[PDB]
């Protein structure tokens, strides 16, 4: 139960002008850059809604996303995840070399302990035998006994966040996408967003990054989140940010509005007609559900119950960073 001062602090935090910048630029302030990648984790921390339609039979559908990050080494894709795991009501961090099939699953596995939380897994690529052991837990949203499958099920609600390295160390720029990841068409479709990061030798970016790392030790939705030097964006302490997700996850249930659904319908019908002829990951009906699940997510961060056209216009730009915008 939350104290009175807790409610006062939550109400005060809700009153900020730009509530999205103060959350997307305070999850981890050491890392410089990577705005959309941090926005993805910020969206995934909250989650979506659970649909119990047709209560006679239901067959419920999961209401939380799954994010995978793949890119060149040295970019820093192992500290955006530590902060994400730390800022959570319940989290767990496990490596991908010291854990086996009996470890991730019940034998109480890592997934069970990460109930209603995040179970971020590092070094995803190094796994070669446990790949076919979580396709059931991720989709069915339940896990049964591992002893000959004699019933005895137990709930397992997880929001797996994974990071991995390409097969050939550095990822070269003249191949096909499918052979640089070593993944089938079954495990590459469950995940909601699959960001691909490159490391190129620019000039201004390096000059800013070196200055930032030397100082430490002594409009599209890509510029409105960036900080122009000459202002203060003082971050919320993680102690106070951990007691905001909890209030947001049990006192508001968002739902879509009639205006927002049209944009998603148009985007789905535009993706399908174009990528059914070109070569890419097949667009099943899962993406239409994914857009709904993420547009509901951008209504639990600002503590509202609706989906305006502006909110549905943000899961269109962040979506074009692993799909069409990046497949080229």
């Amino acid at each position: 139960e939350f104290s009175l001062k807790d409610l006062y602090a939550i109400q005060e935090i809700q009153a900020e002008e730009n509530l999205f910048k103060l959350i997307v630029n305070s999850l981890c302030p050491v890392i410089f850059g990577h705005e959309l990648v941090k926005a993805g984790l910020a969206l995934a921390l909250f989650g979506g809604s659970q649909k119990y339609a047709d209560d006679k039979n239901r067959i419920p559908i999961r209401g939380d996303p799954h994010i995978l990050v793949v890119g060149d080494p040295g970019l820093g894709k192992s500290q955006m995840l530590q902060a994400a795991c730390n800022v959570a009501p319940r989290g767990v961090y496990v490596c991908g070399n010291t854990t086996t099939t009996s470890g991730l699953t019940v034998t109480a596995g890592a997934l069970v302990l990460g109930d209603q939380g995040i179970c971020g897994i590092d070094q995803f690529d190094k796994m070669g035998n446990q790949h076919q052991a979580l396709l059931e837990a991720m989709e069915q949203q339940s896990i049964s006994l591992a002893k000959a499958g004699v019933v005895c099920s137990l709930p397992a609600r997880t929001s797996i966040i994974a990071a991995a390295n390409p097969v050939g160390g550095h990822y070269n720029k003249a191949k096909t996408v499918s052979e640089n990841l070593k993944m089938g068409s079954a495990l590459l479709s469950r995940f909601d967003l699959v960001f691909i990061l490159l490391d190129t030798p620019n000039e201004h970016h390096d000059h800013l990054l070196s200055e930032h790392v030397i100082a430490i030790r002594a409009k599209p939705l890509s510029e409105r989140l960036k900080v122009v030097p000459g202002e203060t964006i003082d971050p919320i302490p993680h102690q106070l940010l951990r007691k905001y997700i909890g209030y947001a996850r049990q006192y508001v249930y968002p739902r879509l509005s009639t205006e927002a659904a049209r944009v998603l319908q148009d985007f789905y019908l535009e993706l399908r007609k174009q990528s059914q002829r070109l070569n890419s990951s097949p667009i099943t009906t899962r993406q239409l559900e994914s857009l709904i699940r993420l547009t509901e997510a951008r209504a639990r961060l600002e503590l509202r119950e609706e989906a305006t056209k502006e909110d549905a216009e943000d899961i269109v730009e962040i979506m074009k960073y692993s799909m069409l915008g990046t497949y080229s």
Binding site: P29, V30, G74, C95, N97, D122, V213
Partner: protein
């Protein structure tokens, strides 16, 4: 006890006109059973000096140690260096590597890395280190902590160690075909190692005779002068300089900050020694070289000394040239060599505004 501090202060105060003579005498006592090996005997001291840890407020903290790796043809002296460095440091655990199971390299019971907190874990025979075991250490080499959830226990342990390893070059070594090909190590692994010094044996008719005379005449310490140093004195020295906390300066950082920007893209930028984990080491070495000379203010001299070692570390492709580590000897006068190195470096990477000031400082000293 004031006696030890008084003795060290006297020793480092006598050598005031010549500052590098003290460092040369310091280095001469490291592994005194071998002849030569200037850069190799300097890199070990720089690595063993250590670094400074900087932790951020909320959750994160960056590394503050260093690592080293040696490759060379059999019959060069890697084992002597490892065995000698396993004794000076207070706490050390020496393992065989391929002769050690997974229970040591990771947690099981405490293994080897967990058992060497605030120490130095020597590792030998790194060529075929049980590939699973050789990838189960990527997390413990860079974050200084272990993170496992085996058997549904959720246990976290701390491991702050400096890894010193040496592996043979499987397959006949070639001047070309950079170590990523000859040794066949993955790019993610071959990026956390600060220095990769290549030892190569070649055609010479003088080093052969000198080594033969050294071994045959049983002449230990050809410098018959009684300066040397006992092992207790060096243990005290490398357990006492680990308390000073140096701070950066302004005549300092800019040199590294320009060197990294120029090295980021010359024409090749190698393939794996160009990432951002280079400026995180070019500082941890410059701060270590300032704790070996009894001061706490990094100046132009420390940066100019740490630039050359890193320049020679990158074998083959570089910006100045590659010099073999084996065929090197102690210079007769280090001051003139330093004065030449400063003038050479500070020209192509343009900060001539500091050359005049440094020369003026060197004049009235």
């Amino acid at each position: 006890d004031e006696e030890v501090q008084k003795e060290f202060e006297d020793f480092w105060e006598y050598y005031k006109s010549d500052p590098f003579a003290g460092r040369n005498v310091i280095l001469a006592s490291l592994c005194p059973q071998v002849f030569g090996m200037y850069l190799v005997k300097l890199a070990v001291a720089m690595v063993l000096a250590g670094g400074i840890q900087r932790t951020d407020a909320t959750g994160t903290r960056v590394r503050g140690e260093s690592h080293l790796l040696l490759v060379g043809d059999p019959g060069t002296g890697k084992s002597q260096f490892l065995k000698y460095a396993a004794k000076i440091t207070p706490r050390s655990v020496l393992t065989t590597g391929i002769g050690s199971t997974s229970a040591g390299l990771t947690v099981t019971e405490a293994g080897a890395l967990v058992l060497a907190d605030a120490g130095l874990c020597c590792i030998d025979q790194f060529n075929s280190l049980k590939e699973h075991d050789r990838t189960s250490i990527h997390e413990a080499m860079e974050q200084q902590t272990i993170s496992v959830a085996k058997a549904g226990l959720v246990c976290k342990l701390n491991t702050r160690t400096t890894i010193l390893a040496a592996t043979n070059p499987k397959g006949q070594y070639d001047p070309q075909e950079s170590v990523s090909v000859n040794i066949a190590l993955g790019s993610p692994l071959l990026s956390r190692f600060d220095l990769i010094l290549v030892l190569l044996d070649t055609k010479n008719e003088d080093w052969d005779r000198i080594i033969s005379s050294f071994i045959l005449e049983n002449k230990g310490y050809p410098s018959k002068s009684e300066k040397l140093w006992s092992m207790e004195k060096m243990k005290t020295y490398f357990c006492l300089i680990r308390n000073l906390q140096p701070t950066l300066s302004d005549v300092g950082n800019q040199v590294l900050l320009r060197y990294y920007q120029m090295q980021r893209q010359s024409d090749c930028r190698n393939a794996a020694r160009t990432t951002i984990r280079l400026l995180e080491s070019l500082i941890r070495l410059a701060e270590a070289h300032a704790r070996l000379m009894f001061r706490d203010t990094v100046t132009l001299e420390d940066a100019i000394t740490v630039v050359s070692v890193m320049e020679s570390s990158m074998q083959g492709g570089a910006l100045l040239g590659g010099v073999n580590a084996l065929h090197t000897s102690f210079p007769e006068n280090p001051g003139e060599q330093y004065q030449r190195q400063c003038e050479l470096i500070l020209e192509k990477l343009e900060l001539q505004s500091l050359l005049s000031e440094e020369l003026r400082r060197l004049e009235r000293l």
